[PDB]
Amino acid sequence: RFQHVIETPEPGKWELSGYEAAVPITEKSNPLTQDLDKADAENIVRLLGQCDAEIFQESTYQRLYSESILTTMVQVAGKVQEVLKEPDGGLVVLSGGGTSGRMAFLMSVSFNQLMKGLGQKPLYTYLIAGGDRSVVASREGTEDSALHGIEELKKVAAGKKRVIVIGISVGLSAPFVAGQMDCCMNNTAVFLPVLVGFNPVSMARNDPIEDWSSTFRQVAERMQKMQEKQKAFVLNPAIGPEGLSGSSRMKGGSATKILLETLLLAAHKTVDQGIAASQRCLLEILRTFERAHQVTYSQSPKIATLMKSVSTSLETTGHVYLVGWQTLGIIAIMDGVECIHTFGADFRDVRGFLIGDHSDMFNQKAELTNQGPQFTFSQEDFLTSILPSLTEIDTVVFIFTLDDNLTEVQTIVEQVKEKTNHIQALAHSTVGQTLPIPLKKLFPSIISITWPLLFFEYEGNFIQKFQRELSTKWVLNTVSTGAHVLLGKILQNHMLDLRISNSKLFWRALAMLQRFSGQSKARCIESLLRAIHFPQPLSDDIRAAPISCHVQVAHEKEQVIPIALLSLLFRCSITEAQAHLAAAPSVCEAVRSAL
Numbered sequence: 276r277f278q279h280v281i282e283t284p285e286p287g288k289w290e291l292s293g294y295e296a297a298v299p300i301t302e303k304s305n306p307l308t309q310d311l312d313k314a315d316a317e318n319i320v321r322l323l324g325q326c327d328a329e330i331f332q333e334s335t336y337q338r339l340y341s342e343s344i345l346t347t348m349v350q351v352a353g354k355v356q357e358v359l360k361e362p363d364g365g366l367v368v369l370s371g372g373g374t375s376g377r378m379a380f381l382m383s384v385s386f387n388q389l390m391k392g393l394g395q396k397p398l399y400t401y402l403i404a405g406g407d408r409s410v411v412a413s414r415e416g417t418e419d420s421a422l423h424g425i426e427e428l429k430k431v432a433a434g435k436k437r438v439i440v441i442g443i444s445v446g447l448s449a450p451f452v453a454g455q456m457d458c459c460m461n462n463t464a465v466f467l468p469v470l471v472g473f474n475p476v477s478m479a480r481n482d483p484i485e486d487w488s489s490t491f492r493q494v495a496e497r498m499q500k501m502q503e504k505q506k507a508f509v510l511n512p513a514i515g516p517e518g519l520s521g522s523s524r525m526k527g528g529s530a531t532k533i534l535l536e537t538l539l540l541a542a543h544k545t546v547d548q549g550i551a552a553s554q555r556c557l558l559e560i561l562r563t564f565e566r567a568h569q570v571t572y573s574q575s576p577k578i579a580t581l582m583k584s585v586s587t588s589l590e591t592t593g594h595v596y597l598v599g600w601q602t603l604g605i606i607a608i609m610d611g612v613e614c615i616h617t618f619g620a621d622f623r624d625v626r627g628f629l630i631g632d633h634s635d636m637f638n639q640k641a642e643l644t645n646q647g648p649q650f651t652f653s654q655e656d657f658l659t660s661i662l663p664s665l666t667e668i669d670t671v672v673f674i675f676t677l678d679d680n681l682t683e684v685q686t687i688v689e690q691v692k693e694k695t696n697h698i699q700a701l702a703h704s705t706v707g708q709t710l711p712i713p714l715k716k717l718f719p720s721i722i723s724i725t726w727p728l729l730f731f732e733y734e735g736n737f738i739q740k741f742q743r744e745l746s747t748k749w750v751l752n753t754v755s756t757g758a759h760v761l762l763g764k765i766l767q768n769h770m771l772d773l774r775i776s777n778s779k780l781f782w783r784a785l786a787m788l789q790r791f792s793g794q795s796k797a798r799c800i801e802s803l804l805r806a807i808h809f810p811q812p813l814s815d816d817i818r819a820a821p822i823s824c825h826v827q828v829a830h831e832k833e834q835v836i837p838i839a840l841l842s843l844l845f846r847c848s849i850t851e852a853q854a855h856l857a858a859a860p861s862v863c864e865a866v867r868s869a870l
Contacts, residue, residue, distance in 0.1 A: 276822065280782075282796050283789040301446040301476035301523060302783065303516035308768040311518060311539035311760060312863050316586075319757040323525070324572040330530045331565040337475075337513040339530065339561065344512045345554040347609055348538040351508050352552035354467050355439055359398065359830075366434030367399045368428065369535070371443035372418025372451050372777075374426075374524040376403030377609045378531045379443055380410050381744075384605065384636050386539055389737060391635075393547065400638065402427045404451040407642040411608055411621065411652040413775035415518040420648035421454025421487035428455045440468045441535065442757050445492070445527030447472040447479030447511070448779050453491040456482075456507070460497055463506040463750035469507050470498050470840070472535065473527050482782065485821050510534065518756075520769050521783050524613045525752055529745065531841040533564045536741050541758075544733050560738060563729065567742040570724060571749050578724045578753055581699050585670050586758040588697060589624060593668030596661060597627040600675040600684070602740065603703075603747050604629025607674055609653050610751040616780065618759040619772040619833045622649045625755055626857045630675075630687070658687075665694035674747050677704040681711055688717050701750055703743040722750065763861025766791070771836055772862050775807065775829035778822045784836050791866065792843040799843065806839035807832070809849045837862045844869045 284292035308322050333340040358365040365384070369379035379401040387397035404424070405417030417423065427600040432438045440459050442452040447470070453684045455842060459468035472479070476499060479492040489497075492752050501507035514530050517523065537560045541552035550556070572578075585595050599607035614620035629652055637643070644649050651660055665671070671691045675684050692698055701722045702710060710721065724746055728806030729735045759765070764772040769790070805813050807829040817824075829835055841852040844866075859865035 276819065277796070277800055280785065280796050280800070283793060283799065289718040293490075297476045298786070300513070300516055301444055301448075301474050301478075301527065302786070304520050304768050305516040305518050308518045311768045312763070312765050314760070316582045316757060317576070317762065319582065319760055320377060320572075320575045320579045320753055323518050323753045323756060324568075324575060326526055327529060327572075327753075328568050330526050330533070331561070331568065337511070339512040339514065339534065340558060342554065344510070345557050347508060347510050348534070348541070348557055349552045349554065350505065351469050351510060352538045352541040352545065353710060354469075354508075355539065356545040358437050358439050359542060359546045362396050362398055364434075365398055366432065366435045366438045368402060368431060368438060368440045369399065369443065370402035370424070370428070370440060370452060370455055372404035372409075372429045373415055374528045374609060374613060375443040375445060375449065375452075375531065376401070376409055376418075377605075377612075378528060378535070379403060379441070381532075381602070381605050381609075382535050382539070384602065384820075385536070385737075385741070386543070387635070389543060391540065391637050400431050402431065402455070404449065404569055407637050408646065408650060408742055410637070411612065411643065412649045413612055413774075413776060415616055415780065416823070416830060418449045418451040419485065419778050419823060419826070421450040421457075421484050424451035424454035425458050428458065434731065436465065437851075438466050440466055442468060443470060443471045443531055445473050445523035445531065446521075447474045447476070447491055447495055447582050448781065450484040450487060450491070450778075453489065453494040454487055455740055456498060457487075457489055457494045460501055463501070468498065468507045470495060470507075470511070471531060472511050473514050473530060474511060475496060476509060476511065480779070482778070485823055496516050507754050518768065519617075519760075519765060522617060522756070522770070523757070524609070524617075528609075528746060528752075532745060532748070533561060537561055537564075540734050540737060550733075550734050560734065562732075563738055563765045564742060564745060567746055568749070570726065571746040574724060574750070576724050577720065578750055579757075580720070580800070581672070581722065582754045582757040582761070584697055584699065585672075585754055586761040588670040589758055593666065593670065595625045595670045595672070596657070597625070597672045597751060598629060598630060598657060598687070599675065599747065600679040601629075601631045602744055603676070604631065606747045606751060610749070610755050614755055614759065616774045616776045617756075617770055618764040619774050620759070626651065626661075628652055628654070629660070630654045630657070630683070637691075662694070665691060666694060667695050668697075669695050670697040670699075670766055671695060672751075673698070673700040674751075675700070675702055676743060677702065677708040677710065681714065685711070685713050685717070688714070692717065701747060703741070763863035771866060772834060773836060775826055777826060777836055779786045781822050781826055781829070784839075787836055788839055788843065791840055791870070794843050799839075802839040802843045803835070804834050806842065806849060834862055835859070837866055841869055
């Protein structure tokens with residue numbers, strides 16, 4: 276079970292260790308954010324803003340702007356336009372787990388809307404590990420099954436003649452995706468698999484998948500072989516490590532969004548305008564999203580101020596609601612849910628809501644209908660369940676554009692204001708538009724983001740929408756990450772308060788123990804398993820159990836890493852470690868005092 280785990284390097288021998296060389300780029304500590312844990316709000320914005328800018332940064336080897344990556348994007352666009360040209364029996368599937376799965380969902384929503392707007396039959400669908408509940412709730416463990424991935428692909432592809440499958444896994448990690456890519460390669464007469472991730476192939480996970488005979492790396496290596504025959508594609512740009520180690524939702528999610536929107540827009544442009552995809556045109560679009568970073572981060576003071584407000588509500592046991600209009604609602608939903616595993620947040624802490632029509636977005640909306648408070652997301656959910664329960668300690672962030680129903684925005688804001696003064700808005704506008712006077716009065720310090728009109732004949736309106744979603748993503752992700760960082764929920768730039776919700780998170784938790792204690796792999800495994808299973812003592816059956824067993828027990832538990840870490844550092848029992856942790860003001864300070 277633990278064979279792939281490398282021994283902890285000896286004290287002082289970390290620098291050039293085989294241990295450090297094997298850490299995937301997606302899991303690496305960013306050298307610029309080692310001080311993230313103790314940074315103030317303004318400094319967190321600068322650190323996270325710098326990291327977000329890194330996805331665009333042109334060694335030029337395998338970067339997003341590299342000739343190699345742009346050529347792969349051109350080839351994939353070529354394959355997609357072949358399907359768009361033949362809608363009968365054609366299908367474009369986007370798939371993933373967690374944020375990658377929610378990005379697949381968003382991509383399908385956006386591109387089916389583009390197609391509907393042009394009077395064409397929609398050809399996109401999404402597959403998310405765990406089904407529709409995973410779009411709005413933390414169900415990370417569902418991606419650990421390759422068979423689940425294959426079954427969901429077989430269902431949507433039934434009766435189709437040509438299926439493009441874009442498998443999204445930032446760390447080249449998700450078994451759900453690996454299974455799909457492998458089965459696509461077994462039938463190239465029907466399927467064209469495209470693997471999207473942000474690690475070199477040699478850094479893809481090589482640990483065993485519980486229900487599959489191939490590892491992610493073996494599948495990715497087979498994809499490299501099929502790429503020589505143009506029967507598969509590996510689209511893996513280099514973006515560098517995340518500001519918060521392994522926080523794939525940030526840079527990884529942003530790079531997934533821009534990469535896929537750019538190449539898919541190019542495929543649609545080929546069919547509609549007759550202009551084939553090119554490195555030059557892909558760069559023009561990508562650089563528009565690069566300009567969006569400068570536009571967004573020019574609001575750094577207000578982002579920092581909002582982060583403080585959100586952190587205050589959380590610290591007081593209040594809740595934070597991100598209320599977004601149309602697709603900005605999807606971005607809002609994606610933000611809150613990630614706080615659960617990342618910082619050990621309760622599902623009630625940060626929740627996103629979509630205001631507007633969501634009727635043609637979900638595959639199986641019945642999976643969400645009256646399922647419980649962990650699954651709220653809609654306009655009806657916000658107005659009927661959240662709004663009447665709002666208190667003075669809660670924060671509500673409103674995200675909209677000046678093309679939204681501003682009477683409806685004003686009405687909802689006023690209703691919320693009766694319950695709490697902790698209101699703020701992120702409003703996107705086109706140069707020339709001004710916020711109505713009642714809204715300026717309700718939001719005297721509004722985060723106003725003004726966008727020049729884009730004159731791209733075909734892509735103009737789509738990029739306008741996409742950049743506003745991306746801008747919203749950066750603001751909300753910096754605010755939610757920062758708000759939890761300010762509460763001492765991280766250590767250096769590592770997720771100390773992480774929930775072990777899937778196998779990738781289990782390995783990240785083990786690596787963190789080895790990193791922070793410097794103790795042997797056997798000692799770190801023993802302490803991690805003891806902390807997960809407590810009060811159940813460790814037995815040989817538990818030590819030999821599959822990782823899924825540890826995940827199932829660990830997923831609803833809080834502070835597993837600091838408990839396991841304090842147990843290693845003090846050579847104490849779990850109860851003694853729990854006492855040490857309870858006496859401290861934060862999880863960051865408890866461990867810092869022990870170190």
